Symmetry: C3
Subunit: 181 residues, 3 copies
């Protein structure tokens, strides 16, 4: 259908540092030629370098790699079990076979070895919504086996938070991009 999502309230479904150590929420809503996205992430397994932040790790990356049918590939940060077209508050029960309608346009965002600013959205965001804890979010489109499409979410910060008992978690963030078809 016109929504491809994690469900609105996913179980731990993402690796930042180790298996299913995070809840990654992503809703892609197809508005014809453009996808409207909202994304959030939270570390949930206690004792990782990001839960609480101990300052040994100052980035968190979620890599989504997609084959030529827009199907999530195994070498992605996120598990594909509940990455699917919407049905009510959950996902359709059968894995989708084609989501090229949700893939980032390869004309707008080409696969290249050159750093191309147009491939990315780069914004200042705030760790746990705290304006004293600035962070950068880079969303990059199409940045073995080789992926045909990709969507990468990179959070980076320079602050030291060790012994503030801060869990890595983000505010919801809105973005858009041109769809492949």
């Amino acid at each position: 259908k016109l929504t491809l999502w994690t469900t609105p309230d996913p179980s731990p479904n993402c690796q930042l540092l180790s298996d299913r150590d995070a809840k990654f929420t992503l809703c892609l809503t197809k508005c014809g030629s453009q996808i409207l996205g909202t994304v959030a992430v939270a570390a949930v397994t206690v004792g990782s370098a990001l839960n609480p932040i101990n300052d040994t790790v100052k980035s968190a990356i979620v890599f989504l790699r997609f084959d030529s049918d827009g199907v999530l590939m195994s070498n992605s940060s996120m598990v594909g079990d509940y990455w699917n077209f919407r049905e009510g508050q959950t996902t359709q029960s059968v894995a989708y076979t084609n989501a090229v309608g949700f893939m980032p346009n390869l004309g707008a965002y080409p696969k290249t070895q050159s750093k191309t600013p147009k491939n990315s959205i780069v914004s200042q965001v705030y760790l746990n919504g705290e304006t004293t804890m600035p962070m950068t979010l880079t969303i990059t489109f199409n940045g073995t086996p080789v992926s045909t499409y990709s969507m990468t979410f990179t959070w980076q910060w320079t602050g030291d938070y060790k012994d503030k008992n801060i869990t890595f978690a983000t505010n919801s963030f809105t973005f858009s991009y041109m769809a492949q078809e």
Copy 2:
């Protein structure tokens, strides 16, 4: 309809510090699973610590509380007179009975949890569009821990640290774009 708004050019319709001391513009456009929003606010007419800014008050808050039908509740910052589905440049003449399609998803943004970071959007914006006057906007979904109790809520909090009393600046914002997952 698929648009729930204040009209594009509202009359003073909002309390920041006192009754109808502000024009709050909000357009919610239903794109299936997601609402696309654009918001702006200006202190107007009524003299106050925000008109002009005298540096005693360095936040402005608009609280929208909704019942289980997504109907605006009386204990909101904004008056409901011209909060309705679109008709041309104005609102339909009959008060809406259901806008649950526009309410923030209680799964995505669970209730009372203003402190769960996923419930909010937090962004750097600019007081009066002046890039020397940085400000934060926090949009919080379903944050409120209140009678009568709201089922859904949307809170807009502007905050800044600068001192502007000498500049005779009235509190006003740029238009700001956001989105959130809809309840249905």
Copy 3:
């Protein structure tokens, strides 16, 4: 939901300082009462003051002027040949005659001589996606034209990038990250 765009991968189609010195990408998607936009720009002609940046110019402005039918007018930064409704990866072959559905609402964003913050979206962005090169983007709806221009625009959309950094000792091409925004449509 209808799309008015530059195509996703435009040829040089834009003046920042001189004719076709830039690639301006703009995709406007009509979501009923609101338009959803994504914009990017890159200077492409080598030897311009923005390619590489020589610090004589620390703003880049794209002015789009539209008549009462929402048709792009001659004195715009962008060429209109491939500004049109989407067909596949390109534009429909016939020039559109009406896009008022895509124009910024004159009630929300009036034409006035008074500076009105609500007419604009202002955000911090980063030159070439580099966080050490902070930049502002101002998107203004229905800003006033040059006083000596005729015919006058009914609608307008201005994109202003500004920065304070000096980059002449580097070899920086002016180019932006993709940027998402929305606005209330006229109809």
